[PDB]
Structures are given as C-alpha cells and as structure tokens.
C-alpha cells in the first residue's frame, strides 16, 4: 500500500498483478495496466496539490491498494478502506472517495460494498451497461462511456446512409449480447432499422459451424449489412469463411468496439474486408504523465511499493539476471520501448472531478474561510455525490467532463473505414460521434456508387403497395387492374362512372361515345328507300294534279286523296327523321309525327271504306272532309296538346348502357331513351284504327256495280296485316347486347317504308299509265 | 459480546436496547424482545451441545452481537462478523451462520453485506415480502412466514364464503401497501374477487378526513366487505366514525395481521364490531425456555454481558434504587410478572435448522468418520445453503420446518371472529389456514343467515344477462321481448317460424290456426241463399217434368233445357263447395266444377241464341245436342284432362301470412293457395263465352213472329253484364290485411248465386204458373 498523508484522503484500486490460479497471485505485474495507472493517479494528485486555486490551503492524500484482477481478493481491500467506522494504536484515516475497479467484475461488488457505506467511487475502465441503474449501484459513476452509447451511434449511421434492413451477429459473452440487446431496444423506438436475422456464435466453435452461420446469413439476400459484435478471432474466421465460400462483393460489414483499426483481423482477408464502419473510442496522450514517468529512478520514487519489480521486469535485472543495479537510469528508450497506455486519460479525470467536487463543496457550506471548516470536518456521501454529479470543466486533452443523473459520461467515438488504395491498407477517419452524428460521406469509398440494404425496392404507380404486418419495412405490391382509380398513393378505389381507367401512367379517360349518324354501313338502305319513295310520291302527285277534271279522278279525290297523300308523305318524313342524331329536337317531334302520318293515312282509308259501304247500303264533300279530318286525327292532336307520349327530352346519356367488363374498350350512346312502351302505345292505337277498316273490307269482299278500287283496298289491308304480323316479332327481337340501335331502327324504318309502298304501289299507283 | 468457544461458531444479532436519538444508544434494554431472545438462542445452543445424536462429537459456539435497533449501527457488527478474511494477536473465529436481524430494516442491508461474503442467515421476525427474491438476498432465509402468504388466505376465505365484490383499505406504510398489492396480484390470477374501491389513509390524518373516506366507501352500497390493512388507532377511528355516521349493520369487516384478537380497537365499538375474519399468526409457548430463564441468578449467568442491567430494571435495584443486591433470587413472580415473548419459537427453530444442515453436511461429504474431517475443516456457503434449504424436521411445539426455493417458510395462521354473546366479548376460533383453508362455518354467527357482497343479484329467465367489460363480475340484464327465443341461458335469438314465443317461464308456443268453417257469422248468408236456390230449381224441374208433352214446353227443352238446368244446378253446387274447409280434396275439385257449371249454362244459352238466329235467317235435335255438348265444354274437359289451372294441392300453410308485429297474438290460415290468376283465367274464359252471346242478343233486339222467350234472353244477358261489371271491382278490393277470406269468398259466392237467380228467375222461372 501507498500511505500518503493529507487532510482529505481518497483511495484507489488498480489491476496490478494478475489472477493467481495457484491460490496466490501469480507474479505478472503487467505494468501496462497496473503501473501506468498508479503513477498517473499519483501524478494527478501531485499536480492538484501544487495548484494555488484548486483546493486552496487544503491538501490531499491517497491510500492505494492492489486488486489482483479478482473480486474476492478485492473484498479485503474494500474492507480495509472502511476502517474508521468500526497497544500502540495508530489512528486510521477516513476515505472520502475511491478511484478504481477497472475490471467490470470488480466494479460490481465493490460498488455494492461501497454503496452499503456511502462512498462515491468514480471508475475509469468499466463500460458494462448493467452499471447504469440507480437501484443497486446508486453511488457509482464512470468517466468512460458505457457500451450502450455506441449502439445508438450505429443506429444513426445506419439511418443516415439509408439502410432499413440489417443483420445482427453476436458473440457469446457479456459484451456482444448486451450490445445487440441495446441495439434492438433502440431499434423499436424509432423503427426503420428492421433486423432480418440475429445470429449467435459459441465461445468454442465446434468444427464446421462457421459455414452454417454464413449460409444462415444468406437466407435473405436483400440484407447486405452485417452489424457485428464479436472478437478478433471471430471476425477473422467469419471473413475467411466468407472468402472461401466465394460470396464476396455481397456484404457490408459494420464494426463495433472490437474491430477498431487493427490490420490483424484481416491479414489475407484484405480483399474481403472492403467496407468498414468500425467505431473506436476517441483517444489522446498526456505529455505531463510521460515527463513524470520517464524521469523516475530507483532512488527518486520510494512512494511506490512495486517499483523494484518494475525496475526488474523492464530491464531483466534481478538485483540480489545480469545482476546490474542501475542499467537504464532513463527508462525511456535505454532498454525496450515506451508506450503510454491508452486508458491513462481517465484516472486523471476521475481525480480532478473529485477535487473539483470538493472545491465546490467548500465554496457553499461555509464561504469566506480559508482552510478546513467546522462545517467541513466530516464529508457527507450524499452531498459529495450531488457535487460530483454537477461538475463541468475542461480536463486533460481539452475534453469536457460531465455526468448524467445516473453518473454516466457522454460518449465520444470516431468512425473509420477500410478500402483498397493503390494496393495498400489505410484507416481514414470518415467522421465522428460526439452527442450527434458527424460524417464524411464525400470521403467514403465502397470499392457501386452508394450501396443499400433496403428490404423492398420502391414501387411504381399502377401497382398498389400494401405494408406487411409485424414490421412496417417490406411493402408488397399487388396489381389492381380493372375498373378502379388510385385515390391516393396506395389505395386504388372504384373509378367513378363516365370515367374509364386508361393505359397512361395513371388516369381515368372518358369513354368514347358512339351513335348512328348519316354516314354508316347500316344507314344507306333506309335513306335510299325513302328518297326513292318521295320521288315516286312526287310522280304520283304530278299525275293527279296534271289531270283533276278527268273523270278517272272523279272516282276518288274529292276529299280523300289529299289526306291519304299527306299520310304517305309523312311516312317517308318519319323514315328520314328516325335515323337523324337525336341531339336536342329530333327525338322530340319523333312521336308526334310518327303518330300523325300513319294516322292520316289509315284514318282516311277507314273513312273511305265506311262511306263507300254506307252509300252502298251523308257523302257530302265538306261533310266527308269534316268527318275525315277529325274522326281520329283530333284524338292525336289532343294527345299532343297534353303531352303523354312526348315527355321532355330524356336524353339519357348512356355512360353505362351495356356495362362492358374488362374495360379496355367500351361504348357510350346519346340515345333519346323514350321507353319502348311509347312505341307500343302508338302502334296499338294505329292497329286499333286498322282493325275496323280491315274487318269492314273483309265483309264486303265482293260488291257489284262498284269501281275497280274496291278490291285493292282489301289487298293493301291484307298485305299490311301480313307485314305487321311479320314485323312485331322483330320488335320482340330487341334487348340484345349485340346492337341496340342497329337492329330496331333499321327494322322500324324498313317496315314503315314497305307499308307505305304497299299502300301506294298496289292501290292507286297502278292504273295511272292510262291517264 | 458473548464469546462462546466451539468447533463451529455461528453468530447472532438481537434488538437489545433501542434507537438513541442523542447519537448514543438510549438506555432502554426493552428486555422483552432483546433478552428473551439471547437467552433463547443460548438455551437452544446448550441443548444442541447436549444431544448425543445431533452433531455427534462436534460442538458449537456463538458470538452474539447487539444491534441497537438501527441499520448503520448494525453495519459495524456485521463487519466484525467477517474478521477471519482480512503484538499479542488473538486468532479470530470464522462464522458459519448468522441468526439475527429481527427488524425488517436491519435484515435488508445485513443481507446485502452477508451475501457479499457467502454467509447464510436465517431471520426470525422479518416478514416483509420484499425479501423473497433471489437476486439481491440470495443467501437470505426466514422461519417466520412472509406477509404475502396471508393475503392469499384472505382470498380463499373471501371465495369460500361466496363474496365476489369487496373494498380494500390500506394504511400508509410498508405493511399495508405491500399487503394490498399482494391481494390485488392474487386477485387477477383467479378472478371472482373483483375489488370495488381502494382507499388510502395518511400517517397523520388531518382533522375531518375519516368521514370522507367512509362516505367514499358508501359509493357502491353493494360492496359490504371491507378488507382492511391498517393500524390499531386507524381501526378504532374508522369504527368510531362509522358508528357516529349511523351506518351500522352495513359493513362486514375483514381483519389482517394487525387486528388479531385485541379488545382495544373496540372498547365502546363493540356494537359496531359485529363480524371479524381477523387472521393471526399461530402461536405457542416453550416450557424449556421458561425453566431456563426463571432459574437464572446474578451468579449463575456470567455469559450474558447485559444481565446486570436486566437484574436492575426488572427489580428497580441500582446496585452501587433501594440498593438491594439480591431481592428476587427467583425472578418468576417475586417482583413483577413473567410473560414469555411471542417470537421465542423462531430463534430455537433457526438454530436447530442450522444444526440439522451441518449434521446433514457431515453425513455425505466424508461418511464413516467421527469428529471433524479434512473435507469439513472449511464450510462452504453454497453447500451449506443447499443443505439448509432441504431440511424437514419437527421442532419445538411439534411444528414442521421447511423452506421453499427462495427460503420462505410456509404460513400457518388461525382465523377468529367477534360477535355479541349474552352481552359479552369473545374471540372463538372459526378455523385455521395451514397450506389450505379450514373453516368452521357452522360455528359462525353474523349477528341475516349468511350475508353476501355480490355485485349483481342473480338474473331471471326471460331477461338476457350480458357480462360487462373490464370486470366479469357485474352482469347487466336487458329485456329482449319480441319474436325471439332463448337458444342458451343468455342469448335470445330469433324464434323459428310457426313457433311463437309465449308468456310462460320460457317457450315458443304454436300459433293458433283459423279458417272459415260451416258455422260462422259470415257464413249463414251463402248457404241459406244456396239452399233456397236449389229448392227453387227443384220446383222448376218438377214443373218441367210434370208437363213435357205440353206444347208450352215445345218452344224449348228438346236439347237445351237439360244442359241449362245442369248448369244452374252446378252453380249452386259451387256455392256450397267454395266455403267448405279445403283440407285435402275440397279445393282440388273447385276449379274443375267452377268452370264446368257456368260453362254448361252460358254455352247452352249461346248455342240457343245462335241457332234461333240462324233458323230466323241445322236445328236437328241430335245435331243440336252434339253442337251444344261439345261446342265449349270439350275445351274445359281437355283443360281438366291436362291440369293447367288445377295444380296438385298447394295447401300453402299460412305460418306467416300477415306477419303480425308485436306477436302477443296472431293468426294462421289453412287456405288452398291457388293463385288469383286462376280465378282470372276462369272468369276470362267464361266472359269470352258470354261476349258472343251478349252481342248476338244485342243485334236481334227486335224480331217478329218469335216466341216471348227471345226478349228475356237479352234481359238476362244485360243483367249479368251489369252484375259482373259491379263484381270485378269487388274482386279488386282484395289484398287488404283486414279479411283475406271473409271478403273474397262471400263476394264470389253471392255473385254466383245472384247470376244464377237472374238467369233463372227472370227468364224461364216466370210464365210457369200458367202451366
């Protein structure tokens, strides 16, 4: 032990020597982690005791103890610490603070025993995340960052690159499992870092297991980022197996606190090490400690009680091989070489933080007094912890020191990379991590531009993306072709009527509209027939007007021929008017004229038959004109006057009409959708007028002393009966998806024309060449 | 300290003295919990050291220490325990076991320090449930049951009575809160113990808060069981406030480990204490310890180092009031009184269990050797704990001692009750709890038969019970009256057709069936008319058969009167046949006869008119008979031969018919549901036969040299036309919910009868009185 005297004595623990399996500490004196830390703590104390404005007139002393890398051995030392609480007796000293427990195993139960006695310790090389809970180590603190502040950094550098799908290797131990658990715990918080697999390697791998794990990694090829937490030999063996397995250019390694910047894990694996995101703890070097340690001799340091063994093992001298007492008076380079240990910037920080806490304590309790105080003759653990956990200052290497509520210092890492460069090896810094992510993506080279490890490639408008369940990371796209529009990016809902989905990138384009018009394959026949019919009717009217006084006319034509000719003309007017496009007016007049024409014709013939029969068994010319012009015509004139068949133009626009399935093509109609029942009622009224004339022509089939006109009346009525009987089933041939406007319209117009021709051609059109 | 020497030395801790607020233990020496336990441990040790078959040749020694009811003070003693691990030096002794830490606060951190050094302790008066986890007190054990083994008992006695709804009071401390949390944790596991409220009282109640809490308990009146966890004064004040508030006979108190059997919590509250389920720890008394403690003097016990103070405070003597050296040589009853402390049966048990564990250890490691062993010269903590936690033996008062995996002894409680008995007070045992529930419900008296605290009273068939959400304890019942049947206890689904829910306890009773039958208010008219009609027709046929040769007959009747009379008879046959119940056959023949009758009549009249007209402008009698019997009758004979109107009997059973809402009453019909369109077609055919006869009667309205029969033919046809024109809207008066079988049937039968009478009464029925 090193019993330095002081007004405020604070102790320490260091890993000097090693675990002695023989029941006694086996002589090692590692002297890299043991000596370089006692000397650093004593250097820090000597510097603090020589600063006029750090602790003022107060001085410090240190009781240093030696943990032999074991826990149970450290227990007796920890007990020795608390000896002022329980015959030339020596008054024992009261410890106010312990700096030690470098190994994380010693830290745990040393923290237990010290928290049972209210002593705030500040560890320097204990990074296990399990010491970050104020329920079993409430008095613990650490200047070194915990291992759970690195995984978060990884997440950041995972996110800032763009990756959303990674693997997670994990060695068997306390380091790898805790690191991977921390990474998974931070994963769920923000998402977007979906982990595909989670492998697990044993401490002692049985022959032939590495290939199995690597092929397990080859389950999902889309996960090309491996976030490893393993040891040097594990990294080497994984990389060698990957190289042998001929699966290069497929993996993007993500380092940890164990890959660092060493060239040892890849000696022949330089080819299969391209890409590294290894995260290493920020380092530094203390010139003052070097100037102290290199200027010590065997008669300048009696404080240290293990310095003879260090003067022996550093020079081979055994005092009492070579029995050389002095040799390297300067131990810098005379014998062997000097290499300041890495974790020498965290014991000076602990000592300085304790001193700063004590100084802050002295400035508040009893200000205005130099030296020791009646309110400061016994330090309290709770107050000292409160002052420790509120320090902010710049220490060695200009690094701020601060603690959280638990007492965990913030992390400060650097990030490296590994890639070929003109057949060589080089770990350039590609950024750092000090409370945030700092990157140098311009100085990055994945020897591919920028690779990625995203689960699902971005989707494309036209095929709907659905997010899978359990992990919002792998969206599956499914095609929803059909009669439907994409309301939003994903959902493709029903596309409204009159709006037909198209073949463009996205759209619902208007359905083309069709309708029979003047020029058409099924349009020449009725217009040709109708023009020929009006030519014939004009020829007939020319014959009748060129000779009217002639007695051949006096058999008719007094008041009947005018009406009958008007009806025959209106029938051809119907023939021309049915087929025209029913935009606004064409379909309005349709029913009115359709009635009136054949009404004139058939009512005239009916009254002619009735009057010839009655005179055979009031034929005055104006009387006959009155009884013809208003017998059945007035009925339809009143029907037109109060619209029953002629509704206001429906113009039912046929967006649907025949609902064409698989709407790659469809049709729309501009028909005037007056119901077929209107055709039924008009036809029925006309046939009702026809029935009486046909019957009364049947009855007088043979009549003497009568003109030759009486028989053709019957012949025309018979022919019209036949043509209408043939017509009506063709009307009942509608309601077929084939042609709703090509069958019915041609049928009706041809029937009308043929009836007009029969009534004309066979009745009074002949026997005119004579006149 | 008491330094007894032995081969295996095991130490102890006891509550001697009390907490000294002055920074020095204030002299109390309670001597009930301090002295009676050192003497008990030393008695146990002396007995074990005098048993030839417990530890054989090995002997035991004890180092006793004094915790002054504090934790921090106990720390120095605990450190003193471990002194063989760290100038006339004395070799120190190695402790193999610690019995102590009676106070639950000392137990915690003493367990911490001892588990840091692998020493198995066995506590005896520490019941806090927080010491039952093998993650911070892995080396702890206790012979006294934990406080979490009582709540479960309560649950059992809550369940075995039948209660499913209780309140939960909880004092402010470690006892009440832990007990209530344990009760709630056991509550969710099995359910059926739904807790209504959870109150909370402060350590120092502000004036006027007790009434507030008691009225909070009066929120839900259905929760009449109060499971209390409080302190003596809290129980007293709650009961006094309840008494004052005039809310007696409404609460069923449930005690705890703090109500016991004391008469102090209810001095004037005897009236408002009726009912108690107080659970107290099973007790006992040790005669050997009494014989030891009462036989000690001031010169018989130098072992104890606090026995002078006990000889002083137990007798007032101050040595050096009254300066009396000896006084009560026997301290049993000479001065003051003796009362063995309650927790004296749990230190002897701890010592005996440790001794048994050591004995078991000596029987397995190196058997066949008497004394100490080279394999037993250093006890191991893990093995000793394994042997401690596997002991089974009968100790003092015949109580088995055994530990769980944690090291918690099973609980053994007794249960009391408190009720008036002839104006007195008495705590009879009503059962016990030793690993199960044992009750004496026959010896229970709630001074009500057996009360209950169930949330919802049991429901009743007819009104469906629905379980509320969050707690399956308070079922709400809702009435589902209507057209629905209870498939199971709760759900009342749709009751099937033809099956009408009833007013019985539960059922769906068949709907009554109705149909017009022979006797009915709307049935006398048609049968009366029809019988009178057949009487008239018989009179007429008598007239015609009594005189046939008479020339008055020779105007008709050659081949026409027979057919016409047959038709008139069949019309009245229809009149009788329509109203009969259409069970199997009645509706089958209905259409056939309905046709045939009026067919005969009207076809006969039609052929008569046609033949009289034709002879006025082939009247051979057999020729006329042939042209009448087959003119229109053969048509219906072929129609009957190939059934078109007469379908196979439908007999559509009218389960629904008019679907009567609010089915407290309804109707069912047995109608033969031949569609009305069959009536339409029969009527249409008959009218078609009628039309020609009516027209040809119209045409010959006036005919010379013809018999007087020619005009009544026309008159009857006119009257029948009128009656049918009046009839058809009455047919179109159907499809009304009022009367589907009372309107149409009477209408049809009366129309048939009137038509028959008109054709008969006005045509050939007159002009017969002459003949």
CA distance B545 to B565: 12
b/e code A671-706 from CB counts within 10 Å (16+ = b): bbbbeeebbebbbebbeebbeebbebbeebeeeeee
Partner-chain contact B86 A80, CB within 8 Å: yes
Specify the length of chain B in residues.
Answer: 771
Under DSSP, is residue A620 helix (H, G, I), strand (E, B) or coil? Answer: coil
Range of the domain at B183: 150-283+414-443
DSSP classification of residue B166: E
DSSP classification of residue A669: B
Token code pair at residue A319: 């005092």
What are the beta bridge partners of residue B225?
B252
**Is A756 annotated as a binding-site member?**
no
Go through chain A and list every residue after which a break occurs, taking a C to next N gap over 2.5 angstroms, comma-separated.
86, 320, 447, 617
C-beta separation of B575 from B526 below 8 A: yes
Under DSSP, is residue A316 helix (H, G, I), strand (E, B) or coil? Answer: coil
C-beta separation of A712 from A763 below 8 A: yes
Closest CA to A190 of A160, A169, A167: A160
Contacts of B242 (CB under 8 A, 6+ apart): B214, B248, B251, B272
Under DSSP, is residue B400 helix (H, G, I), strand (E, B) or coil? Answer: strand
Question: Does residue A355 belong to any structural domain of this protein?
Answer: no
Q: Give the β-pairing of B492-493 and B225-227.
A: unpaired
Under DSSP, is residue A70 helix (H, G, I), strand (E, B) or coil? Answer: coil
Residues in B whose CB is inside 8 Å of some CB of A read: 75-76, 79-80, 82, 85-86, 109, 112-113, 116-117, 136
**Is B125 annotated as a binding-site member?**
yes
Identify the helix (H) or strand (E) that includes residue A610.
helix A588-616
CA distance B126 to B550: 138
The torsion region of residue A666 among left (phi > 0), alpha (psi -120 to 50) and beta comes to beta
Specify the length of chain A in residues.
Answer: 771
CA distance B394 to B408: 17
CA distance A546 to B477: 102
Strands, E assignment, A325-397: 393-394
C-beta separation of B384 from B407 below 8 A: no
Q: Are residues B574 and B425 in the same domain?
A: no
Partner-chain contact A116 B136, CB within 8 Å: no
Closest CA to A65 of A79, A82, A77: A77
Question: Does residue A74 belong to any structural domain of this protein?
Answer: no
C-beta separation of A100 from A48 below 8 A: no
Q: Give the β-pairing of B252-254 and B225-227.
A: parallel
Alpha helices in B363-408 (DSSP H): 381-388
Token code pair at residue A256: 């940890």
Token code pair at residue A679: 């055709």
**CB-based burial label for A6 (10 Å; 0-12, 13-18, 19+):** middle
HSE of A596, CA atoms in CB hemisphere, 13 A: 18
Residue B563 main-chain phi, psi, to 5 deg: -65, -45
Q: Mind telling me how many Å the CA of B623 is from chain A's nearest CA?
A: 28
Q: CATH number of the domain that B107 lies in?
A: 3.40.50.2300
Token code pair at residue A450: 């920028």
Cβ count near B63 (within 10 Å): 22
CA distance A75 to B82: 11
C-beta separation of A146 from A128 below 8 A: yes
In the block, residue with structure tokens 């607020």: B21
Question: Does residue B726 belong to any structural domain of this protein?
Answer: yes
Q: Are residues B16 and B102 in the same domain?
A: yes
Q: Are residues B718 and B576 in the same domain?
A: yes
CA distance A120 to A436: 30
Q: What is the 3-state secondary structure (H, E, C) of A516-533?
A: CCCCCHHHHHHHHHHHHH
Contacts of A128 (CB under 8 A, 6+ apart): A104, A107, A108, A146, A147, A174, A178
Residue of B nearest to A71 (CA): B116
CA distance B714 to B708: 11
Chain Cα centroid distance, residue A352 = 51
C-beta separation of A323 from A75 below 8 A: no
Q: Select from A75, A86, A112 the Cβ nearest to the Cβ of B76.
A: A86
Q: Give the β-pairing of B400-401 and B393-394.
A: antiparallel
In the block, residue with structure tokens 């069970």: B583
In the block, residue with structure tokens 């469906």: B464
What are the beta bridge partners of residue B195?
B166
C-beta separation of A40 from A83 below 8 A: no
Cβ count near B268 (within 10 Å): 10
Question: Does residue B403 belong to any structural domain of this protein?
Answer: no
In the block, residue with structure tokens 């005239």: A604
Residue of A nearest to B87 (CA): A87
Q: Are residues B542 and B667 in the same domain?
A: yes
CA distance A598 to B336: 142
CA distance B381 to B218: 55
C-alpha separations of B686 from A204, A538, B199, B676, B732 in Å: 109, 53, 92, 15, 18
The torsion region of residue A64 among left (phi > 0), alpha (psi -120 to 50) and beta comes to beta
In the block, residue with structure tokens 């590609």: A430
Contacts of B157 (CB under 8 A, 6+ apart): B277, B415, B431, B433, B437, B439
DSSP code string of A691-739: HHHHHHHHHTSS-SS--TTHHHHHHHHHHHHHHHHHHHHHHTT---SS-
Token code pair at residue B477: 């019942």
In the block, residue with structure tokens 């709760």: B490
Residue of A nearest to B77 (CA): A86
Closest CA to B479 of B495, B462, B501: B462
Question: Does residue A19 belong to any structural domain of this protein?
Answer: no
Q: Are residues A482 and A575 in the same domain?
A: no
CA distance A600 to A623: 17
CA distance A629 to A175: 114
Chain Cα centroid distance, residue B529 = 68
CA distance B579 to A250: 96
DSSP code string of B418-446: ---SSS-----EEEEEESSEEE-GGG---
Question: Does residue B405 belong to any structural domain of this protein?
Answer: no
CA distance B367 to B361: 10
Cβ count near B696 (within 10 Å): 17
C-beta separation of A70 from A24 below 8 A: no
Identify the helix (H) or strand (E) that includes residue A114.
helix A104-115
Chosen for mutation from B1, B86, B90, B138 (greatest number of chain A CBs closer than 10 Å) is B86
Q: Are residues B597 and B583 in the same domain?
A: yes
DSSP code string of A142-195: BSSPPGGGTHHHHHHHHHHHT--EEEE---SSHHHHHHHHHHHHHHHHH---EE
Partner-chain contact B113 A116, CB within 8 Å: yes
Contacts of B546 (CB under 8 A, 6+ apart): none
CA distance A537 to A729: 29
Q: Are residues A431 and A470 in the same domain?
A: no
CA distance B437 to A283: 67
Q: Are residues A650 and A688 in the same domain?
A: yes
Partner-chain contact A86 B109, CB within 8 Å: no
Going edge to edge, which strands form the sheet with A279-281? A279-281, A412-416, A429-434, A437-439
Chain Cα centroid distance, residue A301 = 68
Closest CA to A118 of A306, A299, A501, A381: A381
C-alpha separations of B727 from A537, B475, B595, B602, B732 in Å: 54, 63, 18, 18, 9
Token code pair at residue B763: 């045509």
C-beta separation of A254 from A225 below 8 A: yes
Residue of B nearest to A113 (CA): B113
Contacts of A50 (CB under 8 A, 6+ apart): none
What totals of helices (H) and strands (E) does chain B contain, helices first?
19, 21
CA distance A680 to A668: 25
C-beta separation of B154 from B264 below 8 A: no
Domain boundary among the residues B509, B529, B564 is at: B509
Q: Are residues A181 and A308 in the same domain?
A: no
**Is B126 annotated as a binding-site member?**
yes
Q: Select from A82, A109, A116 the Cβ nearest to the Cβ of B109.
A: A116
Question: Does residue A13 belong to any structural domain of this protein?
Answer: no
Partner-chain contact A117 B75, CB within 8 Å: yes
* Chain B residues close to A113, C-beta within 8 Å: 113, 116
CA distance A276 to A252: 7
CA distance B187 to B477: 25
Closest CA to B250 of B277, B214, B279: B214
DSSP code string of B167-179: EE---SSHHHHHH
CA distance B725 to B754: 13
Token code pair at residue B440: 């004496």
* Chain B residues close to A74, C-beta within 8 Å: none
Domain boundary among the residues A476, A509, A542 is at: A509
Q: Are residues A502 and A548 in the same domain?
A: no
Q: Mind telling me how many Å the CA of B109 is from chain A's nearest CA?
A: 7
**CB-based burial label for B479 (10 Å; 0-12, 13-18, 19+):** exposed
Q: Mind telling me how many Å the CA of A79 is from chain B's nearest CA?
A: 8
Domain boundary among the residues B455, B482, B509 is at: B509
Residue of A nearest to B135 (CA): A136
C-beta separation of B417 from B431 below 8 A: no
C-alpha separations of A287 from A307, A338, A612, B687 in Å: 21, 13, 144, 132
Q: CATH number of the domain that B605 lies in?
A: 1.20.1070
CA distance A240 to A329: 47
CA distance B290 to A649: 120
CA distance B485 to B505: 12
Under DSSP, is residue A2 helix (H, G, I), strand (E, B) or coil? Answer: strand
Please count the residue pairs, one from chain A and one from chain B, whose beta carbons lie less than 8 angstroms apart: 29
Q: State the virtual CA torsion across B549, B552, B556, B558 in degrees, nearest 10.
A: 10
**Is B343 annotated as a binding-site member?**
yes
* Chain A residues close to B75, C-beta within 8 Å: 85, 116-117
* Chain A residues close to B109, C-beta within 8 Å: 116
CA distance B725 to B730: 10
Under DSSP, is residue A505 helix (H, G, I), strand (E, B) or coil? Answer: coil
Number of domains, chain B: 4
Question: Does residue B407 belong to any structural domain of this protein?
Answer: no
Alpha helices in B670-769 (DSSP H): 676-699, 710-731, 743-761
* Chain B residues close to A79, C-beta within 8 Å: 79, 82, 85-86
Q: Are residues A536 and A421 in the same domain?
A: no
Token code pair at residue A398: 């200009």
CA angle B186, B189, B190 (to 5 degrees): 100
Under DSSP, is residue A284 helix (H, G, I), strand (E, B) or coil? Answer: coil
b/e code A498-525 from CB counts within 10 Å (16+ = b): eebbeeeeeebeebeeeebeeeeeebee
Q: Are residues A254 and A157 in the same domain?
A: yes
Cβ count near B307 (within 10 Å): 18
CA angle B165, B170, B173 (to 5 degrees): 155
Residues in A whose CB is inside 8 Å of some CB of B read: 75-76, 79-80, 82, 85-86, 109, 112-113, 116-117, 136
Partner-chain contact B116 A75, CB within 8 Å: yes
* Chain A residues close to B136, C-beta within 8 Å: 136
Q: Select from B76, B86, B112 the Cβ nearest to the Cβ of A112.
A: B112
Q: What is the 3-state secondary structure (H, E, C) of B215-282?
A: HHHCCCCCCCEEECCCCHHHHHHHHHHHHHCCCCCCCEEECCCCCCCCCCCCCCCCHHHCCCCCEEEC
**Is A601 annotated as a binding-site member?**
no
Token code pair at residue B436: 């199960």
């Amino acid at each position: 032990s090193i019993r330095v005297d002081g007004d405020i004595i604070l102790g320490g623990l260091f890993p000097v020597h090693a675990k002695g399996e023989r029941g006694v500490p086996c002589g090692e004196l590692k002297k890299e982690k043991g000596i370089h830390r006692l000397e650093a703590m004593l250097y820090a104390i000597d510097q603090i005791n020589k600063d006029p404005d750090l602790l003022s007139n107060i001085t410090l002393g240190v009781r240093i103890l030696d943990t032999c890398s074991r826990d149970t051995y450290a227990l007796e030392q920890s007990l020795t610490f608390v000896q002022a609480l329980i015959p030339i007796f020596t008054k024992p000293d009261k410890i106010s603070g312990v700096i030690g427990a470098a190994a994380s195993s010693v830290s745990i139960m040393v923290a237990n025993i010290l928290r049972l006695f209210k002593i705030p310790q500040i560890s320097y090389a204990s990074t296990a995340p399990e010491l970050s809970d104020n329920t079993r180590y409430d008095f613990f603190s650490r200047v070194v960052p915990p291992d759970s502040y690195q995984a978060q950094a990884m997440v950041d550098i995972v996110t800032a690159l763009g990756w959303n799908y990674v693997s997670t290797l994990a060695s068997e131990g306390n380091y790898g499992e805790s690191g991977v658990e921390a990474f998974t715990q931070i994963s769920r918080e923000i998402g977007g870092v979906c982990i595909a697999q989670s492998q697990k390697i044993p401490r002692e791998p049985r022959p032939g297991e590495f290939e199995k794990i690597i092929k397990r990694l080859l389950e999902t090829p889309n996960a090309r980022a491996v976030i490893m937490f393993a040891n040097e030999d594990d990294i080497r063996r994984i990389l060698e197996a990957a190289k042998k397995l001929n699966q290069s250019g497929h993996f993007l390694w993500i380092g940890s606190d164990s890959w660092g910047s060493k060239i040892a894990p890849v000696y022949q694996q330089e080819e299969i090490a391209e890409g590294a995101v290894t995260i290493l703890p920020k380092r530094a070097s203390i010139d003052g400690f070097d100037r102290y340690f290199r200027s010590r001799t065997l008669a300048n340091n009696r404080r240290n009680v293990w310095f003879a063994e260090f003067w022996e093992e550093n020079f081979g001298c055994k005092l009492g091989s070579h029995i050389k007492k002095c040799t390297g008076l300067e131990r810098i380079a005379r014998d062997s070489s000097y290499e300041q240990e890495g974790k020498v910037q965290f014991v000076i920080d602990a000592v300085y933080s304790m001193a700063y806490a004590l100084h802050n304590m002295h400035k508040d309790l009893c200000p205005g007094y130099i030296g020791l105080c009646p309110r400061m003759s016994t330090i309290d653990g709770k107050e000292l912890l409160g002052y420790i956990r509120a320090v902010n200052f710049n220490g060695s290497a200009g690094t701020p020191v601060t603690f959280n509520e638990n007492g965990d210092a913030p992390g400060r890492y650097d990030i490296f990379q590994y890639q070929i460069t003109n057949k060589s090896t080089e770990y350039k810094v590609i950024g750092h991590w000090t409370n945030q992510l700092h990157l140098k993506v311009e100085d990055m080279q994945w020897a591919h531009t920028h690779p990625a490890s995203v689960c699902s490639l971005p989707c494309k408008p036209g095929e709907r993306k659905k997010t899978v369940k359990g992990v919002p990371c792998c969206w599956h796209c499914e095609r929803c072709e059909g009669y439907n529009y994409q309301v939003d990016e994903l959902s493709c809902e029903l596309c409204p009527l009159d709006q037909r989905p198209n073949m463009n990138r996205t759209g619902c384009q208007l359905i083309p509209i069709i309708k029979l018009e003047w020029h058409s394959p099924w349009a020449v026949v009725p217009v040709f027939v109708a023009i020929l019919g009006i030519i014939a009717t004009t020829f007939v009217i020319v014959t009748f007007v060129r000779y009217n006084d002639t007695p051949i006319v006096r058999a008719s034509g007094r008041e009947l021929s005018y009406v009958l000719l008007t009806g025959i003309f209106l029938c051809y007017s119907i023939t021309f008017l049915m087929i025209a496009a029913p935009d606004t007016i064409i379909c309005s007049f349709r029913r009115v004229f359709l009635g009136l024409g054949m009404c004139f014709s058939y009512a005239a013939l009916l009254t002619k038959t009735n009057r010839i029969h009655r005179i055979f068994e009031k034929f005055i010319s104006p009387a006959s004109q009155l009884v013809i012009t208003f017998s059945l015509i007035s009925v339809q004139l009143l029907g037109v006057f109060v619209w029953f068949v002629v509704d206001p133009p429906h113009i039912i626009i046929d967006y649907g009409e025949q609902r064409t399935l698989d709407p790659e093509k469809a049709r729309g109609v501009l028909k005037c959708d007056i119901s077929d029942l209107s055709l039924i009622c008009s036809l029925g009224y006309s046939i009702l007028l026809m029935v009486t004339c046909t019957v009364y022509a049947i009855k007088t089939r043979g009549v003497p002393e009568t003109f030759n006109e009486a028989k053709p009346i019957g012949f025309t009525m018979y022919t019209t009966c036949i043509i209408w009987l043939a017509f009506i089933p063709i009307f009942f041939g509608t309601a077929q998806s084939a042609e709703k406007m090509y069958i019915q319209t041609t049928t009706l117009t041809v029937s009308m024309s043929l009836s007009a021709s029969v009534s004309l051609g066979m009745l009074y059109m002949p026997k005119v060449y004579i006149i």
